[model samples]
Target chain A: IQRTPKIQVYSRHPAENGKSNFLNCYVSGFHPSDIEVDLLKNGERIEKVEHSDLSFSKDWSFYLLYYTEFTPTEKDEYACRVNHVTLSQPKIVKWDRDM
Target chain B: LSLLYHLTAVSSPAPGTPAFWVSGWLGPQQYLSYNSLRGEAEPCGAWVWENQVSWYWEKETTDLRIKEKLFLEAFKALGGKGPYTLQGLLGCELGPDNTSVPTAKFALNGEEFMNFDLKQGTWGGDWPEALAISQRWQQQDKAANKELTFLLFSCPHRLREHLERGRGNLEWKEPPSMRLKARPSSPGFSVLTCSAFSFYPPELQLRFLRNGLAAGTGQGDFGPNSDGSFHASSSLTVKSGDEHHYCCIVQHAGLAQPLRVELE
Candidate 1:
């Protein structure tokens, strides 16, 4: 009824170089149905892909997000969010792209 | 080349038992793949045991007794050294050469201390082997309860078979599993109910798989199965390592019901 997991990507890093790291957001939880993640930049919906990555796991300690090859720039604004099944605050992690 | 067919002194495979077909690549090679129930299987993956790299040796074998085969040339080409690690599942019935009721024995690092005889049903030594793996790790690490966890990963035969259907549940979600079999509440439980069978010679065979940990050679006890059902008692002092479960093979007719039980 479940699968290994799919890599969840979030936001692309800021880039003036016209190219950005496509952030594949990864959601980690105890069970497969525990949570859901949605990647939105500047409130605009982007195309998404569904898949399960064998590399990621359901361990509670942490989750992994694979970012596509890209460089950081000033024009990119991205953030990561953690959502659980129960009532809780969504801990949004802002992607700091500097230097 | 004639591959190495791993055999155990405890194994009495029938004389005409068919040969096991195993294959693998050492390094840079074409992508590998295989469907279940036939010729080669999806590569079982490699493990760095001691120094000699090894794999699950998950080749498809007609007989689980006598000897299981592995490619020596491929192993060598993959930087295989001695003092290596070895392991695999022990299911299926023995051919004529091993029709006789199997006898179980226990030894510490090869010192026999306990023994028993089993017949008429399946016999699994991963439970007993697990005890030894714990103890062996204990001796090697000289540490106590150093984060040991066990896992069971039974690669199903069919390609992308539905997990709950075709794949063997390592969690023992199905029958004949140690989680349910070894437990006192299990139907396979009772005074000498079920029996544990061995495809390899326990007296000589070394290294095995159970739970999720790699069990090395050690002393194990195989007594009568659970009373008319399935049951037995086994114990081994694990040294240092992280092995949570051991092999909990329910049966071995190719349609295996392998599970893993964590020994806390």
Candidate 2:
């Protein structure tokens, strides 16, 4: 019964130049459980991915927070692409470089 | 994998020699995801202790008289009544020896029911194991006019069971952050939200305060997060120009003290 997915992008700092950390995409208040998420680093898609189960909200809305754990060796651009049935096209959100 | 055993019963009186219209379905938890229960069910070591005799055991068996005696003791413990259901998840895992078990439901007259988890009991002693005797015993009374149905099948639900076990340890603690926002389309009213993100085991008290006093009865709901954690929020309404100082407070096991969010 809803159209757009609410998305928030953030990351955690695990010491040394962000050597080991996780990038998290908090997607909330969406209808229907089926959605596809992709993690891209420096304009290229990475194969290794990990995501949690879809959690249903109390009022029938649903959400899933997709996270990819990685170790960064150098400064690069990272972004997430979300594909959902409700969207007119794919939605892309870039992670904060300073996060 | 975790497994569950369930049973249900009903009472009827008529020109009965004593027979039951016993029926049920058994398989993985996904069996429950579609439609209502249907198809044939297999017996998971169903034993009938009827009258003064014992029947229905195919594998290595329990002592006969002792099993009947155990049944009598259980009847007295549960209650002498009409309709009853016993349902709970079993801490069963699988290897090559044990293949499939029952993972269906308990119900009567089309209305499904859920029983209490006897493991976390208010009572003490070996009563939990003693109560489990009912799982193996099923019987009918020609005199008391009672009939019972036992149903089970071999279904693999390792995926669901694995999730359930993980959820047990997912009760990680978390405090909350606070925020103020517009009350929907109503510009005259403001909304207060106390957000507790990615916490687990779900028991937190969130509230809104007006000048250090409790706000009106706040409403909130607990939800699951993709990270195997949980999230919850409480919202309160206030007038835009109200001079009262408002804040939101969150209480949880994660913090040594309560966390507070103030109107900026």
Candidate 3:
């Protein structure tokens, strides 16, 4: 909840899976003071999990559990961005239906 | 015991349909037709194998327990007009019967479905486009310091050993039972590709067996044409005294027959 490092997670798997999508993201470079996570829907902010679930990578590799109340209206339009205190602009990556 | 494809596999193929697999030898046979399980003509789907290495294109395997229909696409990705060799294959909807290929499904050991999408333009041109780039997104490769020899054998069965060992979770003791013949096209004058999937670690010996084929290290194209034609352009560059073997193995898992062709 209170850190600043970044990681990206997204899959073509339909966002309609209502229960929860069990997926994980692994980050390699981070320090003790920088790491934060923000949830997104179609590249827009959905929610933020700003916690210090700090681990020794000083790097953290956390699997996320995304539960959708509504289905994704589009494809590959969603992704995550990190605001790491040590890193510059948010780093992002996504997997979508290759156009 | 039939694999019902509880994964909601994209096929509704008829009975007695063979599946897909990986190739070991009988090397270098180009991909022809993919029979999707949903019984619909599909051109695109993700081909996932051990540890989920998804390739937009299809490749045959040596597993017999696999069903060719498992990975067969509703759309013909490689072979355009291959004649139907297996049953239920002639049932294809829009595409012509693949006549150039032997076993309608390459499975040799039927491969299974991981995922796919039809949004990408089907028909022609590299679908992923990333494949056409000089290198893959996360590919970490260091050229083999020494000349390497490998073959592409298209076996018809995914030995129980492979299912148990090929989980990508265990150590696979490469087998030597796929006694196949020399292959046709080699990745000639091309740089050798150590891993067909390119995601697996080379330490696992991912290179197919040597049947005297080659592919250059330079950039190339990978996609079936919109006209239902398959044009796979892979190159390999050889040094003044270096040589490599590029093998093309079509496979279906869990079957008992092999589909092979020779280029030489």
DockQ of all candidate complexes: 0.01, 0.05, 0.01
Candidate 2 segments whose C-alpha is farther than 4 A from its true place = A1-23, A26-33, A38-50, A53-63, A68-81, A88-99, B1-191, B217-227, B235-244, B253-260
Over the stretch B79-198, how does candidate 1's per-residue lDDT look in tens digits?
A: 424312222211121225412212233222122322221231211234554343334433433122211100001221111122223122211221232321222322433211122221
TM-score of each: 0.25, 0.37, 0.24
lDDT for each residue of candidate 2 in B1-264, tens digit (9 for 90 to 100): 343322222232123211122211122221111101221222321112112122322111222122223324444445557332222222233446535433322222223232223233111224443334334232322211111111112223432333444333323355543443334326787565555555644577877778888775466655444333455666677787662477778877877888876654
Query: What lDDT score is found at residue B135 in candidate 1?
Result: 40
TM-score of chain A of each: 0.48, 0.83, 0.49
Candidate with better DockQ, 1 vs 2: 2
Off by over 4 Å in 3: A1-24, A48-53, A57-76, A97-99, B1-264
- DockQ winner: 2
List of chain B TM-scores, one per candidate: 0.19, 0.40, 0.17
Which of the two, 2 or 3, has more lDDT? 2
Off by over 4 Å in 1: A1-16, A29-33, A49-72, B1-264
Model 1 chain B scores worst on lDDT over the 10 consecutive residues at B145-154
List model 2 lDDT by residue over A18-72, tens digit each.
Answer: 4776766777776544567788889888787766434333233556667777666
C-alpha lDDT values of all predictions:
0.28, 0.45, 0.27
